[PDB]
Amino acid sequence: GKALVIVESPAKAKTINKYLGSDYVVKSSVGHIRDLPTSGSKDERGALVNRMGVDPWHNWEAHYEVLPGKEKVVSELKQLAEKADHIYLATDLDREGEAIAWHLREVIGGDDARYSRVVFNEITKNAIRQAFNKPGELNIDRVNAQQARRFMDRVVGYMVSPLLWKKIARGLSAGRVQSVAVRLVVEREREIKAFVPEEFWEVDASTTTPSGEALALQVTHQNDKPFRPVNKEQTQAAVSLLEKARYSVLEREDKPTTSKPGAPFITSTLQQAASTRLGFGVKKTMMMAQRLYEAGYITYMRTDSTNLSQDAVNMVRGYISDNFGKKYLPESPNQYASKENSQEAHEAIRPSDVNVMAESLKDMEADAQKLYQLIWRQFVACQMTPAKYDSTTLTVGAGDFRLKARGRILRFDGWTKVMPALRKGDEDRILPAVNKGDALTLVELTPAQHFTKPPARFSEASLVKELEKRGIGRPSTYASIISTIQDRGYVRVENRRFYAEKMGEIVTDRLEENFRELMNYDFTAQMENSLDQVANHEAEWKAVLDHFFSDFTQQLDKAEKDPEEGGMRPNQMVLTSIDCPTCGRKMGIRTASTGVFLGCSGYALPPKERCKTTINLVPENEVLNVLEGEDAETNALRAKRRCPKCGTAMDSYLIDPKRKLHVCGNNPTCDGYEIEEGEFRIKGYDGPIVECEKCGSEMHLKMGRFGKYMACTNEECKNTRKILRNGEVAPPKEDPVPLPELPCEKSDAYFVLRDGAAGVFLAANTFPKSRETRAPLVEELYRFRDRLPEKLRYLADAPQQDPEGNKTMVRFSRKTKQQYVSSEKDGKATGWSAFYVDGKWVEGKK
């Protein structure tokens, strides 16, 4: 009669509808419709299990809920499911798609007959027709695995976070895999700061053949030992001895070489490639990949399988045979093996139709065209004939010294043709055809000085590579790990490189000390493997959840105790010699979620003797020189002072335009501090950058009695914005107007009226706690028209009710950056709108 197909994306809905036709209706169920509770809408344990929804002691009883704005979509889905005869759950291949399909089946009801689980790797006529010829049942095991993961992460977050608030600082968060990623970054930071760049020199030689060709070589042995002078004088002596000596080509080596393409990309490989070639990080890469998949041009972008369908292989082999021809075929397909634990049922990330060139993607933004070009190029490259190089190696001897050249010359190019290198390498040159035992004539020689490379910093893609190596997280997780480590304030990313905040070090050390089992890489990997076993149906979800929860609760109940008992150590203050501008006292070095700062011990004294004066630790932001290449990090390490008490490097902060402060890397475990004088261009407060809408000057982030505000450096302008729960900074501060007469409804608060680029909106006076917002009605504004600032008055003039007598709400037309008024019935738009045009309000069908 009329089948219903349910899908998570509206663009997936439009695309699958192109192939399904009139016998089917397709509906988009945008995101997770059902979930565990999120807002406030032995009694401490009772309140904890209510806030969690999950009760670990009462056998995992979960108390799922439907989130605000989902009720309309749930009602539409239910109405369509009542109209339909058979329901087709067409979520993506992975667990999350199974958990969405489960929530859909459970909300809509009638399980035993009225559901089919559709499964397709690409949104195309043949794949869809084959999937609808043979749909499955809902894989409940994978749903259970996803629920187990979610329950673990909520258990750890909600149980740990109050502990960290009590011991260390309010406004911390924690997470199972997140904390282990932070541990990785902090360990690399400690390796970097505790490293010494040594000094080695190298010599380079310039030579001409009897045939007048020219050759350049590098010098690598003295006295049959490795040539590695330690100082300048030694290098100059070596250069002298070299110049005096006479050179001959005692060694002539030659050999063919063959080079092959990489595998078609898995998600981690795609992120690494997009970072290295195009500069896209993780978020942009996965957003554009999701768009390309939803448009239909590429296969699903969450995969760890390198496998390819026979259809794909035949298509690409046809393309190569037609365009390139037989030399680049080659004789048989290039196989690639993924991990034995990989989702080998999945495909790689490949084009859906190899003939669609990136330029043809009319509806994709240019960055997405570039990403598609990368996917296409890799897919074509993987199956072609490997390339062919011939290689020459030369060694030349003079006195106590031997010096070497290596060069390769390229003679078949097949995979390199489609997928060229970014730049020529050091061996991508032509050594002249000197004979065996040839002679050489000599040109003047150059020394070079180089420093030992530290254990160099990880970027987003290299951190994803490290996680993939250890087995922490999975293809679906990686983007969430990389985002959440930043959002939670333990790690910051700058110069496309990862840097670890002092608070991340504190939390890492505390969590390692107290929760050693949770933070150990092996136990994280074993947990991920056990979730994979659950998805296999090798294990029982509730079982492993119970085992985890028992261990975690043991460690928590140990950790809660006093520090003399051995419980989690509280926050700590490292004193130094500095005069508090408010009392002169010695001053100590402190870490907050905002950063690292200088505090006066009177903060710990009761009101009578309390001192709230604080100083910002404006840091010397490391400015890595891109032109120094690999040197750039080494010289940064060289730039740092070294602590007197230990080898660990020191990190640098500005306290006055006259004074600067050095602090040891192992602070507060190490108590070394140094203070230095000089003419310094101090910022007063350092951190993020923001541009003042009222004067265009730089604007900077500052802390005080109300937490964190944002304030503009121009002394003639005091324009200040403010931080808010889930955004970089609030919109232009102009006339925030309070109303006591509008009550909130989910909370006891009262409503306030606010302006910004988003529009004009009502928001609740305890905003970080209430977080309740709704658009104003026109009649509301009219009721409080005297309060409205002079400009906003026009909105109160607007027509309060539509021609049907429905009621009207005030909306921002982002495409045209103007307010308009619109009416809704049953919560759907009536399709009526009125706009402001030259002092008048004009109204009609939308």
Added chain:
Amino acid sequence: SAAVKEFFGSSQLSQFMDQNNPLSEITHKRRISALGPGGLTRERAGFEV
């Protein structure tokens, strides 16, 4: 109308009706040709046809 008019006026198989004598009338109306659209051209008709 344009298609009908063009077929009846300009098509190769709508030639002038010759009216010398009634025998001409009959033999012209009863004539059966292999030329025209979809047929074959004069300059390529071999002896086999």
Added chain:
Amino acid sequence: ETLRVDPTNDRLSALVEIYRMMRPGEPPTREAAESLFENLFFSEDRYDLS
């Protein structure tokens, strides 16, 4: 012998070949190739044996 000589190995490759044959100078494409083939031979839109 014909099966020993045809470069093609599946339905898609043959469709690509026929597209490449009947219209030079334009890129092959799954949907367009399928559409022109079906409307050219197995549809009354363009073909009719009276």
Added chain:
Amino acid sequence: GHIELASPTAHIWFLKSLPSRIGLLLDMPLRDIERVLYFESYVVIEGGMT
């Protein structure tokens, strides 16, 4: 009379009459040069060390 062309334009005869006189003047095949002259590819004059 005469007409000046905003863009220099080649002759059809020497371009297409087999054998292509311009083609034999160069070492280029005739196909790539004709697709060039209808503006579907560039031609390169060297300077430097690519």
Added chain:
DNA sequence: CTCTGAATCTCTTCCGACGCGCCGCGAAAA
């Protein structure tokens, strides 16, 4: 096992009397 040359295949081009006679009819350009 690979590379080059030679030979065939595939495509493109050119062209099939000539002299009349007769008939009709041009246009999204003005």
Added chain:
RNA sequence: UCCGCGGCGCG
């Protein structure tokens, strides 16, 4: 009016 194209026959 003198231009061009298509069809038909004659030798």
Added chain:
DNA sequence: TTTCATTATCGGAAGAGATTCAGAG
């Protein structure tokens, strides 16, 4: 005073050019 993810908003002949099999290295 809070902490959790993860969304998706005509026939024949000749000439030139291109791909194919056979011989040498």
